[PDB]
C-alpha atoms as a printed R data frame, in Angstrom:
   type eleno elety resid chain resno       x       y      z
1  ATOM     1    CA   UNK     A     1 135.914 146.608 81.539
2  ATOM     2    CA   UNK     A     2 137.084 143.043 80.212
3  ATOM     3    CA   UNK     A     3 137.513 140.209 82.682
4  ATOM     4    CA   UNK     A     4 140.190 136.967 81.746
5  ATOM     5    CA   UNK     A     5 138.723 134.973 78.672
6  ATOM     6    CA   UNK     A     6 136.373 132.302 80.117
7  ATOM     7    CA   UNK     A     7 135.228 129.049 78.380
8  ATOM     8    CA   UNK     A     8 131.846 129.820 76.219
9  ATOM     9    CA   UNK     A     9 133.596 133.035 74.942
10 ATOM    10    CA   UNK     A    10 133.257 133.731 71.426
11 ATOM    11    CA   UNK     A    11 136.495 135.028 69.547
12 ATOM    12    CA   UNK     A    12 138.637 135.123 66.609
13 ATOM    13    CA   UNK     A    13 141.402 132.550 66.982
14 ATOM    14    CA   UNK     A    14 145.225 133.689 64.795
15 ATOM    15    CA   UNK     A    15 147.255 130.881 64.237
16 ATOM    16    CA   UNK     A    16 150.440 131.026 61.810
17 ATOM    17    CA   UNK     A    17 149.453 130.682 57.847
18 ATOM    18    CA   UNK     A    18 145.619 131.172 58.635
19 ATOM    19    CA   UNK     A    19 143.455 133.832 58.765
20 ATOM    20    CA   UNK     A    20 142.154 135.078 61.657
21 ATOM    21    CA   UNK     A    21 139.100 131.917 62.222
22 ATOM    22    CA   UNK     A    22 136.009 131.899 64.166
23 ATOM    23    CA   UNK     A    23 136.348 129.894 67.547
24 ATOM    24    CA   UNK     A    24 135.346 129.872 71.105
25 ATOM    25    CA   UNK     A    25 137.145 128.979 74.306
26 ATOM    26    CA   UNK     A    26 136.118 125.447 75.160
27 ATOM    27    CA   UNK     A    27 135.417 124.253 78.551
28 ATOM    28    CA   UNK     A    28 138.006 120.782 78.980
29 ATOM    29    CA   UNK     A    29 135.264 117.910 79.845
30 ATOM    30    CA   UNK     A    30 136.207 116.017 82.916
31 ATOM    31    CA   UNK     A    31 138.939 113.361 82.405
32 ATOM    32    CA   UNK     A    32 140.218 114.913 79.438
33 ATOM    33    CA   UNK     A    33 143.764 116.470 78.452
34 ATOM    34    CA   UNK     A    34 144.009 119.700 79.750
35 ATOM    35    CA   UNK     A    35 146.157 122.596 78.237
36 ATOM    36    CA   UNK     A    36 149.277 123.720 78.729
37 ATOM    37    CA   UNK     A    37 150.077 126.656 81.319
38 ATOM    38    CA   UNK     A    38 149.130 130.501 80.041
39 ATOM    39    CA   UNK     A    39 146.937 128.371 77.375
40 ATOM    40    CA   UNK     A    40 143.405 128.126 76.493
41 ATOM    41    CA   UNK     A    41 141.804 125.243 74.433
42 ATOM    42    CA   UNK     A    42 140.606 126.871 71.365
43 ATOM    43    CA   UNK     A    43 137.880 125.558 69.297
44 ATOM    44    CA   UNK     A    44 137.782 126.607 65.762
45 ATOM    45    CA   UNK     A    45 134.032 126.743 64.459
46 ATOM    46    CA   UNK     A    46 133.752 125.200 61.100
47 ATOM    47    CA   UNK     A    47 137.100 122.772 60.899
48 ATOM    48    CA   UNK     A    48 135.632 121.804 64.335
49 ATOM    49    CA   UNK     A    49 139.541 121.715 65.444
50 ATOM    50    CA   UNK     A    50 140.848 122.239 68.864
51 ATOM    51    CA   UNK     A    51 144.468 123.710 69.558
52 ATOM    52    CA   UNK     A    52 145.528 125.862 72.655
53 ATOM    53    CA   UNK     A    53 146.472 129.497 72.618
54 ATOM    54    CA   UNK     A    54 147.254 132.114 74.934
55 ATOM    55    CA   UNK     A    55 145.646 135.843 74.996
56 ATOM    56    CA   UNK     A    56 147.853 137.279 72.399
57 ATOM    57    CA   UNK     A    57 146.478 135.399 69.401
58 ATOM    58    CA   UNK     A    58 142.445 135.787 70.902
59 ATOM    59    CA   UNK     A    59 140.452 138.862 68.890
60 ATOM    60    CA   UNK     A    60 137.064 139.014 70.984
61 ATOM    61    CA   UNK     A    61 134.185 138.244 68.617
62 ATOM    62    CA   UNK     A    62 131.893 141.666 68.481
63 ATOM    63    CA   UNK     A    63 134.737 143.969 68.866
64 ATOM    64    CA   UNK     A    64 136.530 142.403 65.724
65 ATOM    65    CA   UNK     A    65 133.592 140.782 63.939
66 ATOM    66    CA   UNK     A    66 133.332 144.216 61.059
67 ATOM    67    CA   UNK     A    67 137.053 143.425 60.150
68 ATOM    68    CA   UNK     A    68 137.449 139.672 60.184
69 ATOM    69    CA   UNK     A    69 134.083 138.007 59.497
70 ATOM    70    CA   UNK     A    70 134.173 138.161 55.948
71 ATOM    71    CA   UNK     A    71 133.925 134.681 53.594
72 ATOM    72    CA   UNK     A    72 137.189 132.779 52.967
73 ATOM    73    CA   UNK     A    73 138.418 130.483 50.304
74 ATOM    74    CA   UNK     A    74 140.144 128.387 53.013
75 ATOM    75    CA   UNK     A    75 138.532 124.972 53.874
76 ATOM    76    CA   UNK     A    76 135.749 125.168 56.784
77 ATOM    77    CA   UNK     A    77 135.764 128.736 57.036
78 ATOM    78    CA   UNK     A    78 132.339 130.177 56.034
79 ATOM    79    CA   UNK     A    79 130.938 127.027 57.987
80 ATOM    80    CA   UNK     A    80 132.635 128.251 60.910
81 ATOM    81    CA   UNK     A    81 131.358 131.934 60.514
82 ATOM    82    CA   UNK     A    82 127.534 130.279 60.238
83 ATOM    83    CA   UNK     A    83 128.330 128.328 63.120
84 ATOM    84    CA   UNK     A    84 129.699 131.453 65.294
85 ATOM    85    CA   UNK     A    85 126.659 133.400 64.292
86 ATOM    86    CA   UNK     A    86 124.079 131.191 64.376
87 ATOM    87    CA   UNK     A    87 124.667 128.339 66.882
88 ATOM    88    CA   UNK     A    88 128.022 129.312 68.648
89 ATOM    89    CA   UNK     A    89 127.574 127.136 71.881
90 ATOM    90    CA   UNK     A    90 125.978 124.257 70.029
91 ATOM    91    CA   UNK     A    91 127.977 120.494 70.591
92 ATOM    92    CA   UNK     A    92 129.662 119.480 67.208
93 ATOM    93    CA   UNK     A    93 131.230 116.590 68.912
């Protein structure tokens, strides 16, 4: 049975105008900004962008992996679905 998302888990991440993008819950280092309540810092593999988003918009990676990793035109895309396959919890500072 699922638990809460936890930082290090490996999702698709729906945001308004995009497809549904690779990403993982980041952890938020010490001293930096934290999220807002109900939110979750989302890193996008690929663009190597952070924004925060709650549950709703969070497709867990297996489960949804047949239907939404596929290549994309858009810009950073099929980096990001090399990066969530092959080196998912890897710094790209």
């Amino acid at each position: 049975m699922p638990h809460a998302f936890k930082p290090g888990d490996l999702v698709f991440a729906k945001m308004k105008g995009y497809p549904h993008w690779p990403a993982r819950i980041d952890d938020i280092a010490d001293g930096a900004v934290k999220p807002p309540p109900n939110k979750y810092p989302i890193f996008f593999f690929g663009t190597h962008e952070t924004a925060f988003l709650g549950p709703k918009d969070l497709f867990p990676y297996d489960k949804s992996k047949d239907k939404y990793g596929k290549p994309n035109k858009r810009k950073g895309f099929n980096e990001g679905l090399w990066e969530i396959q092959n080196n998912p919890h890897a710094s790209y500072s």
